[PDB]
PDB file of C-alpha atoms in Angstrom:
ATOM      1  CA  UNK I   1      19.336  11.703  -0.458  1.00 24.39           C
ATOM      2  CA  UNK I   2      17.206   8.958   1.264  1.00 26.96           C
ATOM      3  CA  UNK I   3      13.956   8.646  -0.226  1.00 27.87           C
ATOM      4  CA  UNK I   4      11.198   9.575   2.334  1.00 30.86           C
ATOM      5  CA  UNK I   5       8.752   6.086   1.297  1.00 31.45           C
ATOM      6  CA  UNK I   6      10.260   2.833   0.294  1.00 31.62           C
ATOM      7  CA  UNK I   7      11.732   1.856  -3.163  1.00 34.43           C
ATOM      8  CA  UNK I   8       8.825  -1.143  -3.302  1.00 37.35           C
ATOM      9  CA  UNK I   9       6.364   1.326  -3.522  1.00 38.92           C
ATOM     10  CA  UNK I  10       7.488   3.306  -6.343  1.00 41.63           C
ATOM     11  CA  UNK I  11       7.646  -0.233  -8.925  1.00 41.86           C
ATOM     12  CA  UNK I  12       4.866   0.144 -10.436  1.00 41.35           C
ATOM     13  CA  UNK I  13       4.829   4.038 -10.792  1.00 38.98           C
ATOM     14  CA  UNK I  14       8.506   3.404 -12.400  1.00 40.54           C
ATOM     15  CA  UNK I  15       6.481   1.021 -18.977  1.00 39.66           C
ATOM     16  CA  UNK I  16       3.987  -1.896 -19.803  1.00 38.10           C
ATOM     17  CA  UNK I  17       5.182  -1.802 -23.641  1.00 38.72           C
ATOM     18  CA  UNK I  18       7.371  -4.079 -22.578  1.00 35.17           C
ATOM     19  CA  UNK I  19       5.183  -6.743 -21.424  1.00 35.48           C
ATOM     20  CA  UNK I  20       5.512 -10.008 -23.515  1.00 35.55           C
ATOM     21  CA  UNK I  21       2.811 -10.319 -25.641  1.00 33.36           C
ATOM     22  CA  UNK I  22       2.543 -14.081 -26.947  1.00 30.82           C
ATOM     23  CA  UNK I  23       1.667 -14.498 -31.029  1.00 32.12           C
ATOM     24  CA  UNK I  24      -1.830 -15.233 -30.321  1.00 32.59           C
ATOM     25  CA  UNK I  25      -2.308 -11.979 -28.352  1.00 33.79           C
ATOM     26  CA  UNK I  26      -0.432  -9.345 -30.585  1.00 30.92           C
ATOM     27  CA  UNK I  27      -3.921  -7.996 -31.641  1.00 34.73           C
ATOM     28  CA  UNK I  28      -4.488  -6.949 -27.493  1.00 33.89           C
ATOM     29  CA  UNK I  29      -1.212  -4.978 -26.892  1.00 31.22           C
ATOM     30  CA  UNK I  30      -2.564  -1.111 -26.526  1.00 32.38           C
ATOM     31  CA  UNK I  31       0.914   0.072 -25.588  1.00 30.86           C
ATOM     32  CA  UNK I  32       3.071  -0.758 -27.939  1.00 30.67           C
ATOM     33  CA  UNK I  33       0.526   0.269 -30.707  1.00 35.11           C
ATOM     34  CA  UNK I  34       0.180   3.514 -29.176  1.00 37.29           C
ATOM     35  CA  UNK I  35       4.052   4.407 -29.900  1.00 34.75           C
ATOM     36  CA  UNK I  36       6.029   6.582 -30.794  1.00 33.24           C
ATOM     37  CA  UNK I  37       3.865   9.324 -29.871  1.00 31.83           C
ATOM     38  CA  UNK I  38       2.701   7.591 -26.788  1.00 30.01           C
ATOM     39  CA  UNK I  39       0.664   7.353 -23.504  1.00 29.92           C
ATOM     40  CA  UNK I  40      -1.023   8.987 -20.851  1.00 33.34           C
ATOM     41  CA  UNK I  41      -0.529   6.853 -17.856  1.00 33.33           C
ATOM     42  CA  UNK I  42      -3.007   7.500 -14.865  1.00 33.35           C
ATOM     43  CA  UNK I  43      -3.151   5.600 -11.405  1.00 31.12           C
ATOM     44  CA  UNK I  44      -4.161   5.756  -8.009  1.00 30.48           C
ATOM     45  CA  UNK I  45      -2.671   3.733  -5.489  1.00 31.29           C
ATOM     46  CA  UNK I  46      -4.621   3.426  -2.489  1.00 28.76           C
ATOM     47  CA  UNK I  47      -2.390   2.141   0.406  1.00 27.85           C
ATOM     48  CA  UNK I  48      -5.189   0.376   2.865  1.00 27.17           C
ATOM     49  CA  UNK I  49      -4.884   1.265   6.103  1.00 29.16           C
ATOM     50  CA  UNK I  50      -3.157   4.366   4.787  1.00 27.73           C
ATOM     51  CA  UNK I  51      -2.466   7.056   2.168  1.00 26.91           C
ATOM     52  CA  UNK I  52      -2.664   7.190  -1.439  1.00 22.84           C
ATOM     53  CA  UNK I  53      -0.651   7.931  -4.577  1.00 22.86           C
ATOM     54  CA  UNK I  54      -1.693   9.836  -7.912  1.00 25.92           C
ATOM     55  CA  UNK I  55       0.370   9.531 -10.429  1.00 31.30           C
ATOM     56  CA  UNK I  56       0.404  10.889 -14.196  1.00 33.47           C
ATOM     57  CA  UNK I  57       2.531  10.192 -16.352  1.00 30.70           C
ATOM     58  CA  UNK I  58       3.826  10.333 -20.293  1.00 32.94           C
ATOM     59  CA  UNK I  59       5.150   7.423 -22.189  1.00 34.52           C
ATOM     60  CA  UNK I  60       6.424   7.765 -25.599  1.00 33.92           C
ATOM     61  CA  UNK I  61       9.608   7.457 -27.880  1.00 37.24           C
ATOM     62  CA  UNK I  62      12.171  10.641 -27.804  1.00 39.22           C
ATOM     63  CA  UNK I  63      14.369   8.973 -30.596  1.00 41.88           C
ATOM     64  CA  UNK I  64      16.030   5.494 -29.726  1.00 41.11           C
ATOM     65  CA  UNK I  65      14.793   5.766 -26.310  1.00 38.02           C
ATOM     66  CA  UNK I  66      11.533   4.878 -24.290  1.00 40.48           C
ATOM     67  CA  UNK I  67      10.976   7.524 -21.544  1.00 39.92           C
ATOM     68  CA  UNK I  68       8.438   7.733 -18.585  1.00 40.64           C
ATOM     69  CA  UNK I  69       8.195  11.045 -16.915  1.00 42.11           C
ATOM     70  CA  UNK I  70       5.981  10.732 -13.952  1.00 41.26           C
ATOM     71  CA  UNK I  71       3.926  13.430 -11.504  1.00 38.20           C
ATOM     72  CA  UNK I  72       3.731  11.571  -8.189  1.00 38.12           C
ATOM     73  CA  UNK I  73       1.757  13.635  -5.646  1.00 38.26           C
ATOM     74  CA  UNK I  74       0.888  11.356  -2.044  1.00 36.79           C
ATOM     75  CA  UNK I  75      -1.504  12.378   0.610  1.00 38.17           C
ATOM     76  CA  UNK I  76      -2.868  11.257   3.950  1.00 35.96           C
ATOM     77  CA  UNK I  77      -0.242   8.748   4.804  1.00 34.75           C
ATOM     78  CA  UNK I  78       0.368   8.222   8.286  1.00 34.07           C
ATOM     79  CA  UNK I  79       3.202   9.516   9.895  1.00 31.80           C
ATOM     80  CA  UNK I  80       4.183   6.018  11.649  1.00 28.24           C
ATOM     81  CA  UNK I  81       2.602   3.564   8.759  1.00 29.81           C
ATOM     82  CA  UNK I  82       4.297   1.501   6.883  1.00 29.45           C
ATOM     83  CA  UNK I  83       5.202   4.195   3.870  1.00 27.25           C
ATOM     84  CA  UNK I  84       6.259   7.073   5.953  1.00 22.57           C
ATOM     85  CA  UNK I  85       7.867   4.373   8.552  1.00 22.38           C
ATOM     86  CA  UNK I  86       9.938   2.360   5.882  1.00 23.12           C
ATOM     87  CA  UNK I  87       8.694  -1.090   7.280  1.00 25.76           C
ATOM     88  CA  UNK I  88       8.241  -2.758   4.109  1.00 28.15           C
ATOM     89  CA  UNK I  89      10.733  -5.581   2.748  1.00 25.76           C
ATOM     90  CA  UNK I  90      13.182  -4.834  -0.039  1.00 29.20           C
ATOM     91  CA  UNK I  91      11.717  -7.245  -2.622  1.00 30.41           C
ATOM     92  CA  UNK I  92       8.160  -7.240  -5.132  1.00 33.14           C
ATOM     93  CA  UNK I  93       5.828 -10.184  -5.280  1.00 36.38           C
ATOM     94  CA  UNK I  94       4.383 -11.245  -8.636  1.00 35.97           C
ATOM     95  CA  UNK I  95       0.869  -9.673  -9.627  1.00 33.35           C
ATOM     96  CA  UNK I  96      -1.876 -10.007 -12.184  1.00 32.33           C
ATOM     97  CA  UNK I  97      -2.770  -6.384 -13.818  1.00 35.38           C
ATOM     98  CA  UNK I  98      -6.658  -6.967 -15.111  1.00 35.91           C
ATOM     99  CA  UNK I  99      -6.681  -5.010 -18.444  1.00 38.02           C
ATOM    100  CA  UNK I 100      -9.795  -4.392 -20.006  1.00 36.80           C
ATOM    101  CA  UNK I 101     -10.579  -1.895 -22.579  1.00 36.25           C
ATOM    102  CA  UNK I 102     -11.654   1.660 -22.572  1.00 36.92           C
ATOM    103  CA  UNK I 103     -13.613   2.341 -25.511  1.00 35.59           C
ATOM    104  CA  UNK I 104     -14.851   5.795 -24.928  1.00 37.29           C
ATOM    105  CA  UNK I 105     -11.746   6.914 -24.465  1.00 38.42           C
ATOM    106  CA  UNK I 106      -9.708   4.932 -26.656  1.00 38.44           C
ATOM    107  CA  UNK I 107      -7.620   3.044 -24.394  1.00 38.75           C
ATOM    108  CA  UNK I 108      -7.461   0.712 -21.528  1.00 37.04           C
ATOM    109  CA  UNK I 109      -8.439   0.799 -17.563  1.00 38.30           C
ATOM    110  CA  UNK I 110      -6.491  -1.614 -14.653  1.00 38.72           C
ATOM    111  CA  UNK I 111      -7.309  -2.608 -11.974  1.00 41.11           C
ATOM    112  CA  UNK I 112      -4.713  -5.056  -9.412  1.00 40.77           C
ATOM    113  CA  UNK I 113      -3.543  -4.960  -6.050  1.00 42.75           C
ATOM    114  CA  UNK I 114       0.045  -4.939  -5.047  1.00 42.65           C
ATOM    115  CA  UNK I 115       1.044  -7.023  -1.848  1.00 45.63           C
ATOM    116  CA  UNK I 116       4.241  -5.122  -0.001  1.00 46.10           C
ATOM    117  CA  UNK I 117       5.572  -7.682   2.545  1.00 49.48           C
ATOM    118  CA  UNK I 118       5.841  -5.948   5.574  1.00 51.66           C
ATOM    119  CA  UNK I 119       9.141  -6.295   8.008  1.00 54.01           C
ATOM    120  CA  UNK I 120       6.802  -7.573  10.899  1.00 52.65           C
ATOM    121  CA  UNK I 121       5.403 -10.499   8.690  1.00 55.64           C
ATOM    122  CA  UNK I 122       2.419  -8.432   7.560  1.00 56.69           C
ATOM    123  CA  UNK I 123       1.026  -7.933   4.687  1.00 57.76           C
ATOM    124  CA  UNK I 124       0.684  -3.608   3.306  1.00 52.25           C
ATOM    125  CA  UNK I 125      -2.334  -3.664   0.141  1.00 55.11           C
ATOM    126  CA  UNK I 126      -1.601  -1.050  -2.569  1.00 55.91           C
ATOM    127  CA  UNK I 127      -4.892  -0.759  -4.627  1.00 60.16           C
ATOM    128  CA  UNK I 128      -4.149   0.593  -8.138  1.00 61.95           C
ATOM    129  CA  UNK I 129      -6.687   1.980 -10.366  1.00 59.83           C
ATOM    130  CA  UNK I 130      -5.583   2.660 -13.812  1.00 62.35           C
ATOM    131  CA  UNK I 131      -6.309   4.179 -16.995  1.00 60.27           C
ATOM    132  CA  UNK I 132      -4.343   4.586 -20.144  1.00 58.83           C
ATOM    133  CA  UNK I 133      -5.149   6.911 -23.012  1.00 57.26           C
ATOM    134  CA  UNK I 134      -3.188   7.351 -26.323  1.00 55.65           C
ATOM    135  CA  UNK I 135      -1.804  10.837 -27.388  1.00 54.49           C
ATOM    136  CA  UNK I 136      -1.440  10.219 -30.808  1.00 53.91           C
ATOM    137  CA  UNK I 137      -4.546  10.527 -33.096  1.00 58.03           C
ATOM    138  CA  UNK I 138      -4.108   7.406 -34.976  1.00 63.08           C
ATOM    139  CA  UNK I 139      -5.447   3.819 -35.027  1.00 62.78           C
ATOM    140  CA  UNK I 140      -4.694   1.993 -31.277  1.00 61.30           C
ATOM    141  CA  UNK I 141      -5.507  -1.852 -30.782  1.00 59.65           C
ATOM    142  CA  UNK I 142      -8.571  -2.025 -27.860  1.00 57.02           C
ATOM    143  CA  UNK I 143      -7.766  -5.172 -26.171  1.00 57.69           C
ATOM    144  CA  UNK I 144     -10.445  -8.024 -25.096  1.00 57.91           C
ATOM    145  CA  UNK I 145     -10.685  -8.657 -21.293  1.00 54.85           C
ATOM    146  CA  UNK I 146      -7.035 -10.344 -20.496  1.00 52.54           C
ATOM    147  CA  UNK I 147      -4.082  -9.638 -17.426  1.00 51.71           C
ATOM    148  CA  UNK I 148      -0.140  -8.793 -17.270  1.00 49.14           C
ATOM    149  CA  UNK I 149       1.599 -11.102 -14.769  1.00 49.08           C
ATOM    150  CA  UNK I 150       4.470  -9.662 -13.400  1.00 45.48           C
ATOM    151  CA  UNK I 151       7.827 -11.412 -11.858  1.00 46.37           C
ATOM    152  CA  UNK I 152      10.313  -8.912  -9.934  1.00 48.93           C
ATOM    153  CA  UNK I 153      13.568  -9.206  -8.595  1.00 47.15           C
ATOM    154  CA  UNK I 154      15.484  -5.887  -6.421  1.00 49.07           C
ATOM    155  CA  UNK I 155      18.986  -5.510  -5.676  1.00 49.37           C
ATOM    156  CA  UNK I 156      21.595  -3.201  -4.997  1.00 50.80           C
ATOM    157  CA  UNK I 157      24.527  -1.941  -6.999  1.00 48.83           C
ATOM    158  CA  UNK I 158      27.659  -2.297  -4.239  1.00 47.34           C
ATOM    159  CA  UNK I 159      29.690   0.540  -5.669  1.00 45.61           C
ATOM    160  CA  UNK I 160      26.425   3.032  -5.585  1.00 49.69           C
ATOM    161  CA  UNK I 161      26.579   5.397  -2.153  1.00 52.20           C
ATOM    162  CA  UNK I 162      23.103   6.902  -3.466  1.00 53.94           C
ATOM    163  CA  UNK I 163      19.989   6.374  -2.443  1.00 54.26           C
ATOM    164  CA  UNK I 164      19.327   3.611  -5.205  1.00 55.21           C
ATOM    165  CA  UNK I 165      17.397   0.689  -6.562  1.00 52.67           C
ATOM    166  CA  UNK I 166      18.453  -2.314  -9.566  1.00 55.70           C
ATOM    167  CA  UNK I 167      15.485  -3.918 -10.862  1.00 54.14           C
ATOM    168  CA  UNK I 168      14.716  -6.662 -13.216  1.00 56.71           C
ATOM    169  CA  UNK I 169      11.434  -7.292 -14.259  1.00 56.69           C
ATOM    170  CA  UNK I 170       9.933 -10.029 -16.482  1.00 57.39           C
ATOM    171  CA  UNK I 171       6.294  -9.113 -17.689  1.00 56.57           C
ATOM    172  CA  UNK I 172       3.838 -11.905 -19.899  1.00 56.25           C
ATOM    173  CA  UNK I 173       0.353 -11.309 -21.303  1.00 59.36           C
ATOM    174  CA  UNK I 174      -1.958 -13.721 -20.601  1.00 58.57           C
ATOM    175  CA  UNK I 175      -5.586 -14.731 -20.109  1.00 57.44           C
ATOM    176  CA  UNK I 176      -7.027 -15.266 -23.365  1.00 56.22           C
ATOM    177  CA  UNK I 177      -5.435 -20.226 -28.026  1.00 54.56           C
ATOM    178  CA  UNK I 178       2.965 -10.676 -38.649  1.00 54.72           C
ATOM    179  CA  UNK I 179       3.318  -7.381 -36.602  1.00 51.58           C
ATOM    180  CA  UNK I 180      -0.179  -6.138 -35.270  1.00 50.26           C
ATOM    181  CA  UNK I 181       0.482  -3.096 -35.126  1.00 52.03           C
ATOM    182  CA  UNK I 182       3.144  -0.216 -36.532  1.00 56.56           C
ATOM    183  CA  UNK I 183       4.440   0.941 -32.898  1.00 58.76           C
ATOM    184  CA  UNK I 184       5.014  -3.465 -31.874  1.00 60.19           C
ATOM    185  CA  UNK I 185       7.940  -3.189 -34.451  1.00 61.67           C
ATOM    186  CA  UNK I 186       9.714  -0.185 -32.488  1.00 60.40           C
ATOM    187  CA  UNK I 187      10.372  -2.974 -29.679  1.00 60.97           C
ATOM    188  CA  UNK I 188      11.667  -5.897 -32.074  1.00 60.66           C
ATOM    189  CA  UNK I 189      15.202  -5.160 -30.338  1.00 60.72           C
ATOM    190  CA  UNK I 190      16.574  -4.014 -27.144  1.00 59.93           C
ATOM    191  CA  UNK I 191      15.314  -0.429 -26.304  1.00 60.91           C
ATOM    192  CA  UNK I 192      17.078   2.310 -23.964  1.00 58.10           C
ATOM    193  CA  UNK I 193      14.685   3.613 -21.141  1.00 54.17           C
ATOM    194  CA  UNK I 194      14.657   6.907 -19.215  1.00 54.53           C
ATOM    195  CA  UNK I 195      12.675   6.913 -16.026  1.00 54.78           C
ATOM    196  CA  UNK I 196      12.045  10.319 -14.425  1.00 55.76           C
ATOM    197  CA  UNK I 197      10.062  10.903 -11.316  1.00 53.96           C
ATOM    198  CA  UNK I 198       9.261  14.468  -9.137  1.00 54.37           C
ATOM    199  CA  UNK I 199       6.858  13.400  -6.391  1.00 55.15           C
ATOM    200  CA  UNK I 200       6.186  15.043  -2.888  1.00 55.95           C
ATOM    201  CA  UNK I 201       4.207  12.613  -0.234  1.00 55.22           C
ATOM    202  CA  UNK I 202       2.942  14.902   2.490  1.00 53.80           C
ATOM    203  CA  UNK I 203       5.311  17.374   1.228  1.00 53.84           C
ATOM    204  CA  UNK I 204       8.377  15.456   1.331  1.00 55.29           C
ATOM    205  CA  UNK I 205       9.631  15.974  -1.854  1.00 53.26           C
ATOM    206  CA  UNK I 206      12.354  13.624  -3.955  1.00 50.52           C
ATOM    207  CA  UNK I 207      12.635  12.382  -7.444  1.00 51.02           C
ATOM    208  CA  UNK I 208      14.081   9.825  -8.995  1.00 50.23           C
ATOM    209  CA  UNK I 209      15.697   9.224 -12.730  1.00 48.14           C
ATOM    210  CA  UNK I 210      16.397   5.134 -13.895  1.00 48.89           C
ATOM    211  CA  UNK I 211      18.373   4.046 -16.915  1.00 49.13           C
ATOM    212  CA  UNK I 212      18.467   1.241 -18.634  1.00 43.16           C
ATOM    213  CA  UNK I 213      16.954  -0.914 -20.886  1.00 42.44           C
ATOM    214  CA  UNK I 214      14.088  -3.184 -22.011  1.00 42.47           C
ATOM    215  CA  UNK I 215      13.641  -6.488 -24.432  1.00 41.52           C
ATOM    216  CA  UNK I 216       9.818  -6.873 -25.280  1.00 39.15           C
ATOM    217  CA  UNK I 217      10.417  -9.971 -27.028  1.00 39.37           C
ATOM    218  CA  UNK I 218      11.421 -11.383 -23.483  1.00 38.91           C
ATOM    219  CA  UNK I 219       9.231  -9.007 -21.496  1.00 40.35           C
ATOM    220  CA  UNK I 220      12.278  -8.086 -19.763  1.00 39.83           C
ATOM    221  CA  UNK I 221      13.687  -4.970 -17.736  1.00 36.96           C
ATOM    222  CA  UNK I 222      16.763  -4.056 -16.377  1.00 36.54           C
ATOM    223  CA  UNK I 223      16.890  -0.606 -14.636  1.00 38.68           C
ATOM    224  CA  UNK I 224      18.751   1.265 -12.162  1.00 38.43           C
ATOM    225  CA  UNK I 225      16.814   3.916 -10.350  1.00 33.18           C
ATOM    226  CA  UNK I 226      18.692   6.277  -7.981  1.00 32.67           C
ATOM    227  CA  UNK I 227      17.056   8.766  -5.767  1.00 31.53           C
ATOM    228  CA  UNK I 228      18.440  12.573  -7.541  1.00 31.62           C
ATOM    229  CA  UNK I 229      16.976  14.283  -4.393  1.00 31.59           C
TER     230      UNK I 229
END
C-alpha cells in the first residue's frame, strides 16, 4: 500500500557502479572494482528540520544481476513535517556526491546534500553521510578526491494501481585531464538490477522491490520501484 514518506526520499537509498566513469578516471571507480562480491553501503540521511535515515545495505553480483538489499530504519521525524506529511514534489534535482577515499578501511566516505523541493515552494535538506567498504578480500581501486553528479527524472507507469515509482537516472564522474580493474568489465553491457528495501520510519513499516536495468557505459538507470507493503 501507500508508502508512509515520499518516493523522493528513498532515491538515493534505492547502485553507484553505474556511474559513468570517463577514460581518464577508470583508475578512481571503487565500485565497480569491488564486484562481484561487492559492497557495504552505509548512510545517514539527516532531514534538517527533521528526522533521519540509516541505511545499510549490500551490493554485489548474484549471477547476471546487480542487487541492492537495503535496511532502512527512520527516527524522530515529525509527525506533520515534510516526510511524515508527504509535502515534497514528485521530481529529484541534480547533486554532486564528494567521494574521497577511505584508506583505513579500504574504501570510500560521501558526503552531499540532497535538495527535496517542497509543495509550498520550500526547500527540505537531506544531509547524507556515507561510507562504502568492500566485502571481498581482494585488490579495490582507492580513488583521489573527485564527485558523482547526478541527473534524475520520476514518472509513473499509467497501467500500475500500486504504490509505485519509474526512474531514470544518468550518473558522470567528474572532478579530476584498458579496463582498470577486473569487476569494470562485469558492466561493459547492460546489467539487470534488483532493488529490495524493508524499512520502518517511526514504526511505519513498508518495503519496496525495483527491477530493471543499468548501462555503465552511459551511466544510465531505468527502474521501476513499487511499494510491496
Amino acid at each position: 500500500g501507500k508508502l508512509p514518506v515520499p518516493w523522493p526520499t528513498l532515491v538515493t537509498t534505492l547502485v553507484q557502479c553505474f556511474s559513468r566513469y570517463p577514460d581518464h578516471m577508470k583508475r578512481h571507480d571503487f565500485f565497480k572494482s569491488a564486484m562481484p562480491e561487492g559492497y557495504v553501503q552505509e548512510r545517514t540521511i539527516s532531514f534538517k528540520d527533521d528526522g533521519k535515515y540509516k541505511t545499510r545495505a549490500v551490493v554485489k553480483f548474484e549471477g547476471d544481476t546487480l542487487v541492492n538489499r537495503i535496511e532502512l530504519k527512520g527516527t524522530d521525524f515529525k509527525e506533520d513535517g515534510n516526510i511524515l506529511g508527504h509535502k515534497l514534489e514528485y521530481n529529484f534535482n541534480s547533486h554532486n556526491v564528494y567521494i574521497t577515499a577511505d584508506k583505513q578501511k579500504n574504501g570510500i566516505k560521501a558526503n552531499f546534500t540532497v535538495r527535496h523541493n517542497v509543495e509550498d515552494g520550500s526547500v527540505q535538506l537531506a544531509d547524507h553521510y556515507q561510507q562504502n567498504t568492500p566485502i571481498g578480500d581482494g585488490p579495490v581501486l582507492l580513488p583521489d578526491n573527485h564527485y558523482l553528479s547526478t541527473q534524475t527524472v520520476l514518472s509513473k507507469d499509467p497501467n500500475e494501481k500500486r504504490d509505485h515509482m519509474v526512474l531514470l537516472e544518468f550518473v558522470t564522474a567528474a572532478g579530476i585531464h584498458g579496463s582498470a580493474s577486473q569487476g569494470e568489465e562485469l558492466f561493459t553491457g547492460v546489467v539487470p538490477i534488483l532493488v529490495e528495501l524493508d524499512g520502518d520510519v517511526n514504526g511505519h513499516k513498508f518495503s519496496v522491490r525495483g527491477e530493471g536495468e543499468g548501462d555503465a557505459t552511459i551511466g544510465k538507470l531505468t527502474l521501476k520501484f513499487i511499494s510491496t507493503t
